[PDB]
């Protein structure tokens, strides 16, 4: 729970 | 002014987009990618402007900085004097559907059964039922729970893709786009209708829209509502009329997302486009209908009445709701 997946 | 570049997921959505583009006098143009996540990446790169997304995909897109712009509004259950564009959205009911003839089957006897999901990462199809299953089992091994499944977007060689059927040629087994026979709401309901699976994770509207002559599609045209049942979390089974008391969750409506600096323009253009091509639009059904696709829910759900304005300029977490966000985040700890 924090960052973009890409 | 600038053109709006829509992103189509797969070739069926591309064809529909291309018709829209022509009818719109190139006010809307089309990019296409093979999956939703790839379209999200095109938008993050600036190579497309926007697409409409289920809430699980809004989670992905919103972690990456895209924002909600307008939401699908289906017909309200109650009279409202408000214009569709200003009516608050209601959310849809995620449900677990089985055949009535499959008499033993309840929520508490799903293990080792065959399941049909809309796609990995989607609300009703995946986040809500697998989030509940991981919690009740105390196990992250959601990939070993059902004996076999069709869960578009999973590893095509794994049990989670074993019931998927691909396109007219078996090409593209398990891809998360409409070329997979069992993709999406209508695909996963077909997987149950055909007895490929024991249970389908869809929404309440899918069952009504594809039974009792509401769909003339070949696989659906002869299905009867009474031949299906909903699984309630207390272990009971109910007729599909009882969805308001036998659902897994209430989901946030699918919605259009964009980059923040394009959201205002995307919003103005969609509001004009639906005035031309929306339900009762100036030029629908005459020329083109943005919210029809012969039941296949291409670009938008076919049951969309309008795209509605959002209250409170919400962030993605405000649109999804804190409960849902927290459920997704809990589940994504498993992977
Ligand atoms: C394509 O987009 C343009 C621009 O928004 C539309 O042209 C405008 O039409 C509106 C409404 O009829 C008028 O307010 C303006 O005179 C036009 N604006 C500009 C900047 O030219 C056009 O109608 C859209 N066409 C389609 C088919 O969507
Ligand atoms: C389950 O979904 C169906 C289909 O969307 C809902 O039934 C429709 O409700 C509208 C609005 O009330 C009616 O005017 C339509 O005619 C209904 N469609 C069909 C095909 O019957 C139903 O209300 C939903 N159930 C719950 C509890 O939300
Ligand atoms: C699965 O269980 C987790 C862990 O209990 C649930 O997360 C909780 O959700 C409630 C309601 O929103 C919050 O008050 C808690 O703080 C959350 N707990 C934690 C540790 O994050 C999650 O909602 C459950 N998943 C589903 C689909 O119901
Ligand atoms: C209506 C379904 C509930 C989900 N939800 N919670 C807060 C806001 C919303 C919605 O905006 O989509
Ligand atoms: Fe959905
Ligand atoms: Zn409820
Ligand atoms: Zn806010």
Q: What are phi and psi of B307, to 5 degrees?
A: -95, 130
Q: Do the domains B2-73+255-316 and B74-254+317-327 sit in the same CATH topology, yes or no?
A: yes
Which experimental technique did the depositors report for determining this structure? X-ray
Nearest protein CA to atom 11 of ligand 3, as residue: B323
- Give, using CA atoms, the residue closest to atom 7 of ligand 4: B321
Question: Residue B303: which of B7, B5, B77, B12 has the closest Cα?
Answer: B77
CA distance B203 to B8: 23
After which residues, if any, is chain B broken (C to N > 2.5 Å)?
Answer: none
DSSP of B172-222, one letter per residue? TTT-SSTTSTT-HHHHHHHHHHTTS-SEEEEEHHHHHHTSTTS--STTTTT
**Å from A4 to nearest chain B CA?**
4
Q: Which of B153, B124, B126, B168 is nearest to B11 (CA)?
A: B168
Put simply, the answer to whether A4 touches B41 (Cβ < 8 Å) is no
Partnered with residue B92 across adjacent β-strands are B251
Q: Which of residues 277-306 of B touch A (CB under 8 A)?
A: none
| Sole residue written with tokens 């593209």 | B172
Cβ within 8 Å of residue B174, ≥6 positions away: B150, B151, B152, B153, B154, B156, B161, B164, B166, B180
Q: Delimit the domains of chain B by residue range.
A: 2-73+255-316, 74-254+317-327
**Ligand 2 centroid distance, CA of B323 (Å):** 25
CA distance B326 to chain A (A): 9
Residue of B149, B152, B144 lying closest to B118 (CA atoms): B152
In this structure, which residue's CA is closest to atom 18 in ligand 3? B326
Centre of ligand 6 from the C-alpha of residue B263, in Å: 32
Residue with the smallest CA separation from ligand 3 atom 22 is B327
Report the CATH fold assignment for B74-254+317-327: D-Maltodextrin-Binding Protein; domain 2 (3.40.190)
Between CA B126 and CA B107 the distance in angstroms is 15
- CA dist B260 and B109 (Å) reads 45
Superfamily (CATH H level) for B2-73+255-316 = Periplasmic binding protein-like II (3.40.190.10)
B36 is in an annotated binding site: no
Cis (ω within 30 of 0) for the bond into B285?
yes
Q: Which residues surround ligand 5, an ion (CB under 5 A)?
A: B 54, 123
Residue B259 Cα to ligand 7 midpoint, Å, equals 17
Q: Name which of A1, A4, A6 is nearest B329 (Cβ-Cβ).
A: A1
B254 is in an annotated binding site: yes
* Mutation probe of ligand 3 site: the residue of B322, B327, B329 with most atoms within 8 A of C-beta: B327
- Residue B183 Cα to ligand 5 midpoint, Å, equals 12
Could you tell me the strand order of the sheet in which B28-33 lies?
Answer: B28-33, B4-9, B50-53, B255-258, B67-74, B304-308
Length of chain B: 335
Q: Which residues line ligand 4 (CB under 6 A)?
A: B 89-91, 250, 252-253, 319, 321
φ/ψ of B260, rounded to 5, equals: -50, -45
């Amino acid at each position: 729970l924090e960052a973009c997946a890409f | 002014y600038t053109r709006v570049v829509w992103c189509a997921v797969g070739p069926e959505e591309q064809k529909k987009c291309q018709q829209w583009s022509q009818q719109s006098g190139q006010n809307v143009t089309c990019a296409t990618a093979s999956t939703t996540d790839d379209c999200i990446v095109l938008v993050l790169k600036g190579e497309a402007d926007a697409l409409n997304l289920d809430g699980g995909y809004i989670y992905t897109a919103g972690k990456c900085g895209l924002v909600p712009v307008l939401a699908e509004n289906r017909k309200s259950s109650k009279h409202s004097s408000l214009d569709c564009v200003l009516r608050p959205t209601e959310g849809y009911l995620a449900v677990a559907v089985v055949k009535k003839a499959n008499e033993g089957l309840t929520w508490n006897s799903l293990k080792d059964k065959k399941s049909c999901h809309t796609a990995v990462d989607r609300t009703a199809g995946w986040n809500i039922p697998m989030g509940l299953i991981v919690n009740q089992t105390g196990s992250c091994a959601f990939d070993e729970f059902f004996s076999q499944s069709c869960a578009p977007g999973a590893d095509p060689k794994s049990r989670l893709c074993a019931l998927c059927a691909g396109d007219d040629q078996g090409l593209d087994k398990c891809v998360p786009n409409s070329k997979e026979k069992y993709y999406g709401y209508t695909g996963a309901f077909r997987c149950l209708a055909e007895d490929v699976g024991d249970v389908a994770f869809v929404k309440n509207d899918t069952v009504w829209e594809n039974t009792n002559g509401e769909s003339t599609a070949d696989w659906a045209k002869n299905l009867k509502r009474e031949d299906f049942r909903l699984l309630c979390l207390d272990g009971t089974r109910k007729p599909v009329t009882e969805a308001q008391s036998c659902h897994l969750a209430v989901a946030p409506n699918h919605a259009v997302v964009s980059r923040s600096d394009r959201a205002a323009h995307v919003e103005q253009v969609l509001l004009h486009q639906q005035a031309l091509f929306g339900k009762n639009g100036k030029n629908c059904p005459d020329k083109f209908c943005l919210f029809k696709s012969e039941t296949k829910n291409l670009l938008f759900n076919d049951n969309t009445e309008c795209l509605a304005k959002l209250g409170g300029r919400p962030t993605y977490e405000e649109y999804l709701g804190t409960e849902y966000v927290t459920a997704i985040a809990n589940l994504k700890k498993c992977s």
